[model samples]
Target: PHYSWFSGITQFQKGKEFQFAEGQGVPIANGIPASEQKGYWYRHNRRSFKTPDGQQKQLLPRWYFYYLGTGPHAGASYGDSIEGVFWVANSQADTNTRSDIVERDPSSHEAIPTRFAPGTVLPQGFYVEGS
Candidate 1:
């Protein structure tokens, strides 16, 4: 079945590192067996954009699978699930703590102007150390 998602978790315990490449599926659950690792799958996107000064800048790419997994913050209620799109300023230089959650276009996948608080607790072995 040609699925777009791949199975993997974070390697945070080994020094806050993620060994997966772009377009890989990452389970959000940590410290649990692979069978219990459910919830959502994050896909890394190497999308880039241009700044106002005409300098090319890359926007950190970290978004939910949207379809492959159970959805963002799965198993949580409506008011508890972390809604919107999650992203960081620099995928290679920014920590997940410094990331931002914002609304995005469902069709175009472009980020909107709305900002939301990133309140979800990142699962263990699912974080990347900032450079």
Candidate 2:
């Protein structure tokens, strides 16, 4: 089974600097165990039985993300510039963020429009960096 989600708790330690590749992400828990993580990667899927009189419909595929945290990038995410594209980490699970994961046609390692996160600033460089 392939899990699309990634955890940051164990990925990095405090006061550490690292770059995450495109499609790579850090959990909202901010460096905590998966069980005690205080964020949701996807919508809840708890099993719920239905009665003859009434049935309960569960939530659809909803987007989830990290909330209520503080640090250097209090409300910002970082993505790696690898595989010819960008994958910002610590990002919200929304349309804008998901757009970064799309692969380009012809499969060229070129930068696309949906590479940067929600900000209006120019990057010092125009290409992905290697570790």
Candidate 3:
């Protein structure tokens, strides 16, 4: 089964730095945007969702990011910049958790294989990723 409306969430803070690659994202949570809003353009300021704080327009939930080989932030550089339909925020993550807000994709309803290997899947899709 597939969560018809899945999204991605990258667990990075405002100051931290990392690059995400473009990939198929899983539907996560109610607020996650649809496929039309994700992918490369969304990440590179071309296209994405925004959260409004009164008059201020901010990107909400999660967004996509395009890798242009290098970002101007004060950090190390990666040769092969990865494009991330940047699972920006698990906007629905439990507020108390130290981790970023990664809302569960309600549509997928796909849980990891067992009770034992918790945290086993990547934010993109269920039952994927190697430990």
Question: lDDT of each structure?
Answer: 0.32, 0.29, 0.29
Name the lDDT value of residue 97 in candidate 2: 31
| Highest TM-score against the true fold, candidate | 1
Backbone clashes in model 1, listed as residue pairs = 10-125
For model 3, how does the per-residue alpha-carbon lDDT over 17-60 read when each residue is reduced to its tens digit?
A: 33333333323334333332222213333334455645445432
- Model 2, which residues run further than 4 Å from truth? 1-42, 47-52, 67-131
Model 3's number of clashes is: 24
In terms of lDDT, model 1 sits at: 0.32
RMSD of each: 15.2, 17.7, 15.5
Top lDDT prediction, candidate number: 1
Compute each candidate's TM-score over C-alphas.
Answer: 0.26, 0.20, 0.22
lDDT of 3: 0.29
What TM value does model 3 have?
Answer: 0.22
lDDT of 2 by residue, 1-131 (tens): 11222321111222332334433333322333323222222222243557677877542221123322222222333332223222333432442232222222234433222222334232222222221
Ten-residue region with minimum lDDT total, candidate 2: 1-10
Q: What's the count of clashing pairs in each model shown?
A: 1, 6, 24
lDDT of 1 by residue, 1-131 (tens): 11212232223343443222332223332232323222233444465788889978865434443221234443333223343323222123222121122222345443222111244334345543321
